[PDB]
RNA sequence: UCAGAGAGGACGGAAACCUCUCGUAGAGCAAAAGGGCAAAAGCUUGCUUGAUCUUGACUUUCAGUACGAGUACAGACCGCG
RNA sequence: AGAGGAACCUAUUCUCAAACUUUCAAUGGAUAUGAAGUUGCAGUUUCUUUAGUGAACUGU
RNA sequence: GCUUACGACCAUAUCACGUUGAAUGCACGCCAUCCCGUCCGAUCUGGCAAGUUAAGCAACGUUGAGUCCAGUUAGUACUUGGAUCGGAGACGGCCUGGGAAUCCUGGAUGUUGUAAGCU
């Protein structure tokens, strides 16, 4: 009896306008393990992909195994927001073929791959800069995020409208036609 | 994964005070704002609380006791409307007209506004309003609550609103729009223009060139209103013209009667019947399954 | 020949022997360590005020 | 022999009490303190600056000084066979008013108003003392429907 | 409440009990004297009584011993007007004197029993 | 050798576990502390014996593990290894302190005298108050008679004065039989291995459901 | 906003870096221990020299001496905002 | 020490703390309980306040 | 019966899941020329008003956890003062007065001030 219109009724809530999932951010990562000039040329693969300047990302410790030591600048990463952030994704997936594991997607409602090589993301060789492989991270998150960053009054994000591993690979399946791959040989 | 947020946890916790828990005094600010020295005993200390919310500027002058702050004045940029304006009334032009309203509301309230007419000459020129005669010009003390403070910012709009309306409020120009951060330079001309809205004439022409359509989606209603980029400054000096030819407050109207539109909460009664219902249809659903 | 044997055994008899004076009752009355931007406000105050 | 450090011994007593940590309410500020008044000592460990020594916790002085965040306070010391008077300025964070001197002010206050009144309605003049309490008066008790129980002592039973 | 708590406090050292008619009369009639300028006078006339406590109409011993009896409004002058009772041994002694009255001994309240061994004393 | 135990007898020094501050302790004598049937079901054995003291003394690590060997092989002699539970309710946690000195001829030479006689851990000993309960075990009601005689040969390795008694709880539990039986029966009380749980009433109807009491 | 945990991401592994959730302080605050601290007293960063000149009062040890340390003011000139 | 999902998690369980504690006595410590007080009126101040606004003082 | 700004006490106010939300409002929200701040208009800042109560927020629901109050524990534990009191002692009771706290049981789930507004 009831059961009927409250099922209705949470679906017409979900079909709400404000719901939609959307590409919060693309996150670029290229961790080279040491400073200098192989650093200097990354930011330059990624200031040349994106098309605003990196930052870096020093070493919170040393080890010896990484040839690693504290305070030494070894990653650079970029965060990127909107059109040119759906173009790279779209470059990552295409290099990708459009194809994604299932364990790729958080519980949360993100997911990351890599590319080994970003020449394949249509950008000519330089002898000079090299080849350099980089991690793709896509935030999804729906309209009114802000309510859990803003500096006065912020809140916490409801149960219903956060997001979810399955939504996110509905979501990813739709717009990119996207495949998801058998689990990999554990 | 061992739970973190168990009995212990909730046992062990403290709750923050609860302006604090909804984001929205901070305590620390408070404390320097609000306490008087003990030797001034109970004299007030006055406060000028500018809040910008998404459609509304709210000023308000206030002091504080151990019941609570007593508000003892206050202006509204939606109550601009009977003044003129019927949109933009969050602007920087709307946040010093909102100022201004609320200086000469309160000084014709304590019957200070003849004595001190305060700056009535736009000038964009730093002014601190200069003791006359011997009662002293009203004092308050600025509180942005959690706004950024930032060049240019409406909070130090409406600051400079109520200094120029004739309160006094310690202030420097560092922090009004047309100051230079590099060279410490103040354009009192550009000051001038932001308050009277230039700058939204200018991003109308801009706009205008631009694209038809965007200029529309973004000025939709100041189009409906009839307020175009030949006008609006002209708006603006009436606006400022009337508020400062009549302040007092608009009048209150009757208490019609109200309804209740929420639930009630239930009764013990009640919840010990809900009670019973639950678990006879619960084992209704065990013996049936 | 230890000798240092502290103690506190007669003490209390020996305070209470001639009893325990409680301070005097004009101690409120003096101004000292009050502060000298009121004391000097209330000199000037004390000297202008008129007789009759 | 012990250390002879400012705070020795204050573990507890300096310490905030249980899920009552953190920012400090402001009406601890908004209280009003005059020359002359009683306030009771109790050190706020959260506020290291000005605080009154170990010594005059927990015991009530009359205040002879209002500065800008602080008062100083007569507060009664014992040193062998006398008492002295000490002076202490304590900030106000460590400080609270003292109710038994309103409670005798309400008391005075009461007395007088009762006094005039009944001088001006031509009344006699009201007893105005604290008496103790005297020995109960007599009575009469009714065992309707409480008829009295006849009680013994209970047998020793082994509770294992 | 206020003299209880005394009372409770001197239980070890004095015994305690309450007066009747016989035990107020024999006190001051017998061993009755007055404190004038702090000199012990015995009291061998109503006049000495008179002129301490003619102010407050306690004018003769039954005045006196009727204000003690009934708890006066002038209680307090009439019984400190009384220099402390100063009474014999009693006849036939004591039981234990370091043991509560409950406890068959001497100390603390004996209550009506007080008269009884008033009767010894005096 | 072990100094006689009239030496640490009786409780005089305020508690001394092993901390941070005393350092060097060594083990205790007994680590065992549950013997027989120890996995029992809490039906198995309904039947609840106990071994109070009568004295507020130390009883060594030595004395305890003492006691509990005689009463563990009386016990599986006479009953088998799972005809019983037996659970030792004392540890020794006190560390008791032993100012060593040389008993040599000529030793006075290097004693050092009481200067400075802060003395050392010499051993392990459980701190005891009267109606404590020193040994505790649950059997069928057919073997009281075994627990008996078990905790008297028991209580002669123990100083002072030791009382046996039979308790009416079932088993270690902490309802006496009856109650507990009752509340068995109604599903108030769920098995938790040797001891049972109370399920009380308030919460949610969904976990209520699982059981409804 | 910390310690830490969970879940994801080329080389990257138990451990490098990136991302999102949870996180009453379980971190950090030069050092011993104990108090205190969460839009801070912690981390990042801008500007600075109040770690300056001057006299009294007071607390601590206490004989109510001194030194040392500290507290609340008052006068001057400044720093940040 | 087992119980329910070798470790792990959950709910339990036996026994403890001078340098553990949510809670917390009895004894104990301190302050106040009017004339050096309470109400008003009528003056002073260069302190304080936008302000007789307060604070304090003064008065045969 | 509610919304907002500023508060007082600082969980009876917190936390989890869910239902509802009239009007004002708050909020999300659109844009980024200008002021302003960022690797990034995400935050901050500025100009707006197409759209939404999805979230925040408010009210309500839960034999909800927590918190708070009360009962019970119990005249029990402990304890002031007394004894040429019992006992080898450890300790124990009696006389004289104070007098708790867990488990467990039941109930409550913010109160309220100034100013402005809706109904």
């Known amino acids: 009896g009831d059961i009927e219109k409250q099922t209705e009724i949470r679906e017409k809530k979900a079909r709400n306008v404000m719901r939609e999932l959307k590409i919060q951010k693309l996150c670029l990562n290229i961790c080279v393990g040491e400073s200098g000039d192989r650093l200097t040329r990354a930011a330059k693969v990624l200031e040349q992909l994106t098309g605003q300047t990196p930052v870096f990302s020093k070493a919170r410790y040393t080890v010896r195994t990484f040839g690693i030591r504290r305070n030494e600048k070894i990653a650079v990463h970029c965060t990127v927001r909107g059109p040119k952030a759906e173009e790279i994704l779209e470059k990552g997936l295409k290099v990708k073929e459009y194809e994604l594991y299932k364990?790729?997607?958080?519980?949360?409602?993100?997911?990351?791959?890599?590319?080994?090589e970003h020449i394949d993301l249509g950008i000519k060789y330089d002898p000079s800069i090299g080849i350099y492989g980089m991690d793709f991270y896509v935030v999804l998150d729906r309209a009114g995020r802000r309510i859990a960053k803003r500096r006065r009054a912020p809140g916490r994000v409801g149960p219903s409208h956060r997001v979810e591993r399955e939504e996110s690979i509905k979501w990813f399946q739709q717009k990119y036609d996207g495949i998801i791959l058998p689990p990999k040989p554990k | 994964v061992k739970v973190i947020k168990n009995k212990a946890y909730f046992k062990r916790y403290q709750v923050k005070l609860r302006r604090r828990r909804e984001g929205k005094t901070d305590y620390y600010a408070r404390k320097r704002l609000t306490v008087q020295d003990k030797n001034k005993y109970n004299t007030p200390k006055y406060r000028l609380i500018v809040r910008i919310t998404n459609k509304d500027v709210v000023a308000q002058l206030a002091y504080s006791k151990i019941e609570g702050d007593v508000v003892v004045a206050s202006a509204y940029s939606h109550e601009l409307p009977r003044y003129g304006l019927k949109v933009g009334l969050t602007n920087y032009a709307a946040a010093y007209a909102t100022?201004?309203?609320?200086?000469?509301?309160?000084?014709?309230?304590?019957?200070?506004?003849?004595?001190?007419?305060?700056?009535?000459?736009?000038?964009?020129?730093?002014?601190?309003?200069?003791?006359?005669?011997?009662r002293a010009p009203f004092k308050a003390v600025l509180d942005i609550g959690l706004a950024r403070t930032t060049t240019g910012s409406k909070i130090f709009a409406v600051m400079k609103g109520v200094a120029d309306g004739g309160i006094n409020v310690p202030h420097s120009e560092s922090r009004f729009f047309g100051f230079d951060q590099e060279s410490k330079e103040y354009n009192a001309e550009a000051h001038r223009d932001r308050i009277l809205g230039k700058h939204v004439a200018d991003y109308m022409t801009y706009l205008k060139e631009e694209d038809e359509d965007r200029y529309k989606r973004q000025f939709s209603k100041f189009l409906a209103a009839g307020l175009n980029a030949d006008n609006l400054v002209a708006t603006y000096q009436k606006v400022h013209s009337a508020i400062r030819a009549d302040a007092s407050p608009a009048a209150k109207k009757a208490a019609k009667p109200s309804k209740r539109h929420t639930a009630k909460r239930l009764t013990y009664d009640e919840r010990k019947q809900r009670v019973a219902d639950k678990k006879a249809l619960l084992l209704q659903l065990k013996e049936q399954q | 020949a230890k000798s240092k044997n502290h103690t506190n055994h007669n003490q209390n008899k020996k305070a209470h022997r001639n009893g325990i004076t409680k301070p005097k009752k004009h101690i409120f009355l003096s101004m000292k360590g009050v502060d000298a931007k009121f004391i000097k406000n209330l000199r000037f105050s004390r000297k202008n005020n008129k007789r009759q | 022999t012990n250390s002879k450090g400012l705070r020795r011994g204050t573990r507890y007593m300096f310490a905030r009490d249980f899920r009552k940590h953190g920012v400090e309410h402001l009406s601890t500020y908004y209280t009003q303190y005059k020359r002359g008044d009683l306030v009771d000592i109790k050190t706020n460990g959260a506020f290291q600056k000005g605080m009154p020594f170990?010594?005059?916790?927990?015991?009530?002085?009359?205040?002879?000084?209002?500065?800008?965040?602080?008062?100083?306070?007569?507060?009664?010391?014992?040193?062998?066979?006398?008492?002295?008077?000490?002076?202490?300025?304590?900030?106000?964070?460590?400080?609270?008013?003292?109710?038994?001197?309103?409670?005798?002010?309400?008391?005075?206050?009461?007395?007088?108003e009762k006094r005039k009144a009944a001088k001006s309605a031509g009344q006699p003049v009201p007893a105005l003392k604290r008496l103790p309490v005297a020995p109960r008066g007599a009575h009469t008790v009714t065992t309707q429907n409480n008829e009295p129980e006849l009680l013994a002592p209970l047998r020793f039973e082994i509770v294992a | 409440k206020a003299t209880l708590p005394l009372l409770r406090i001197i239980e070890p050292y004095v015994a305690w009990g309450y007066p009747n008619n016989k035990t107020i009369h024999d006190l001051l009639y017998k061993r009755g004297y007055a404190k004038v300028d702090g000199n012990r006078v015995p009291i061998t006339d109503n006049t000495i009584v008179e002129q301490s406590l003619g102010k407050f109409n306690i004018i003769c011993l039954e005045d006196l011993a009727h204000e003690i009896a009934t708890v006066g409004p002038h209680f307090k002058e009439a019984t400190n007007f009384l220099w402390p009772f100063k009474l014999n041994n009693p006849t036939g002694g004591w039981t234990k004197k370091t043991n509560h009255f409950v406890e068959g001994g001497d100390f603390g309240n004996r209550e009506d029993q007080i008269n009884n061994l008033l009767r010894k004393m005096v | 050798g072990r100094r006689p135990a009239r030496c640490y007898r009786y409780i005089k020094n305020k508690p001394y576990p092993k901390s941070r501050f005393c350092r060097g302790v060594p083990d205790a004598?007994?680590?065992?502390?549950?013997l027989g049937n120890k996995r029992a079901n809490v039906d198995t054995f309904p039947a609840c014996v106990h071994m109070m003291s009568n004295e507020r003394e130390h009883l060594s690590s030595e004395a305890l593990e003492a006691a509990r060997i005689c009463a563990n092989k009386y016990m599986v002699k006479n009953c088998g290894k799972d005809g019983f539970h037996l659970r030792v309710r004392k540890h020794p946690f006190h560390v008791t302190r032993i100012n060593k000195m040389l008993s040599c001829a000529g030793a006075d030479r290097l004693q050092t005298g009481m200067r400075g006689a802060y003395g050392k851990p010499q051993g392990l000993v459980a701190r005891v108050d009267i109606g404590d309960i020193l040994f505790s075990m649950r059997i069928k009601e057919g073997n009281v008679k075994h627990a008996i005689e078990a905790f008297r040969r028991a209580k002669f390795k123990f100083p002072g004065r030791q009382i046996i008694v039979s308790s009416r709880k079932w088993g270690f539990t902490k309802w006496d039989r009856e109650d507990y039986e009752r509340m068995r029966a109604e599903g108030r009380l769920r098995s938790d291995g040797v001891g049972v749980q109370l399920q009380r009433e308030h919460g949610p109807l969904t976990k209520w459901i699982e059981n409804p009491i």
Do not use: M
Request: glycine share 12%.
């Open chain 1, 103 to 116: 364990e790729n997607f958080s519980d949360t409602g993100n997911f990351g791959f890599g590319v080994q």
């Open chain 2, 99 to 134: 100022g201004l309203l609320l200086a000469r509301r309160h000084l014709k309230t304590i019957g200070l506004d003849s004595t001190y007419k305060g700056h009535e000459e736009l000038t964009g020129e730093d002014y601190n309003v200069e003791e006359e005669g011997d």
């Open chain 4, 54 to 112: 170990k010594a005059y916790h927990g015991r009530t002085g009359r205040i002879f000084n209002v500065t800008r965040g602080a008062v100083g306070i007569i507060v009664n010391k014992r040193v062998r066979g006398n008492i002295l008077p000490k002076r202490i300025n304590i900030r106000i964070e460590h400080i609270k008013p003292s109710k038994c001197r309103t409670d005798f002010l309400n008391r005075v206050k009461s007395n007088d």
């Open chain 6, 29 to 34: 004598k007994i680590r065992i502390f549950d």
